[PDB]
Curated annotation (Swiss-Prot), chains A, B:
GO-annotated molecular function: Atg12 transferase activity
GO cellular component: phagophore assembly site membrane
Record GO biological process: autophagy of mitochondrion; cytoplasm to vacuole targeting by the Cvt pathway; macroautophagy; nucleophagy; piecemeal microautophagy of the nucleus; protein modification by small protein conjugation
Gene: ATG10
Record's keyword terms, sorted: Autophagy, Membrane, Protein transport, Transferase, Transport, Ubl conjugation pathway
Principal cellular location given in the protein's record: membrane
Effect of mutating residue 129 to S: No effect on conjugating activity. Normal autophagic activity
Protein name listed in UniProt: Ubiquitin-like-conjugating enzyme ATG10
EC number per UniProt: 2.3.2.-
InterPro entries: Atg10 (IPR016524), Atg3/Atg10 (IPR007135)
Residues annotated as transmembrane: none
Protein's UniProt keywords contain Transferase: yes
Entry's family note: Belongs to the ATG10 family.
Subcellular compartments: Preautophagosomal structure membrane
Length: 157, 157
């Protein structure tokens, strides 16, 4: 693990949102900042290999672990009896959709339930990669975290 | 959170098991150390508020967060059409059982899937109360954690 304090997360999250980085990301359909500005929902544009899908990322702060928490869910279209239908993708399939690159998902399967909605805790790696010995680089934590936890499996380009 | 490295967790867990603190605990039906001595299963004696329940606690280590995880599930006997039957308890009720006495859970509702079994990750609070400050008390740390995460809502006896 790592630690970034909440005040630092809050600030960097607003700064990131303001930067327009997600707004000008061509992948990204729309961006939303929660009321507390604690959290950010990204909706990716329709993707087939990355029968179309729609990917949702909820960027949040875990107050228990003091680290960002990336919540994942995916809408899949599926032909049922010849009829196109939409369902929420099941985790084991999310595990296939992805590893095809980044074959490793860390730790234990973890479903986060948000007011009735089911999300996947996304953990390709240990967030401790992001910090150095002395925490010198704290100011860019979130930005670099984005590169590792998001851009790495969904290319900016 | 307050991180503890796997080496120290592993030692203290095996050490905790040795003290027989769980074996002589009145509430405890049985204690099992997983094959790797990584994790510890506690089955508790039949209770209702402390047709009866059966509570299971799995003490494990998160490599993602470098913190212990208390995994929790509960067998409740319900009377269905007049016939006693058992079921795994729903999280809302696990809350309304624990949450009433009392009284808290931090963060989002987290479900953990172990080889198909469903566990509710139990966080009465952040672990940042357990250590810090050059950590002269690190060695205890699992013992403090047990006091805060387990004995607080169960009661040592
Ligand atoms: Hg990493
Ligand atoms: Hg605490």
């Amino acid at each position: 693990g790592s630690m970034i304090p909440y005040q630092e997360w809050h600030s960097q999250l607003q700064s990131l949102y303001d930067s327009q980085i997600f707004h000008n990301w061509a992948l990204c359909q729309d961006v939303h900042l929660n009321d507390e500005k604690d959290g950010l929902l990204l909706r990716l544009i329709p993707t087939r290999q990355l029968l179309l899908n729609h990917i949702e990322l909820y960027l949040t702060y875990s107050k228990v672990y003091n680290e960002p928490l990336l919540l994942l869910r995916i809408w899949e279209e599926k032909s049922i009896d010849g009829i196109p239908m939409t369902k929420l993708m099941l985790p084991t399939d999310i595990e296939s959709l992805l590893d095809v690159q980044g074959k490793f998902q860390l730790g234990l399967d973890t479903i986060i339930n948000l007011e009735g909605s089911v999300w996947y805790s996304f953990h390709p790696c240990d967030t401790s990669c992001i910090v150095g010995d002395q925490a010198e680089f704290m100011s860019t934590y979130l930005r670099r975290w984005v590169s590792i936890f998001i851009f790495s499996w969904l290319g900016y380009e």
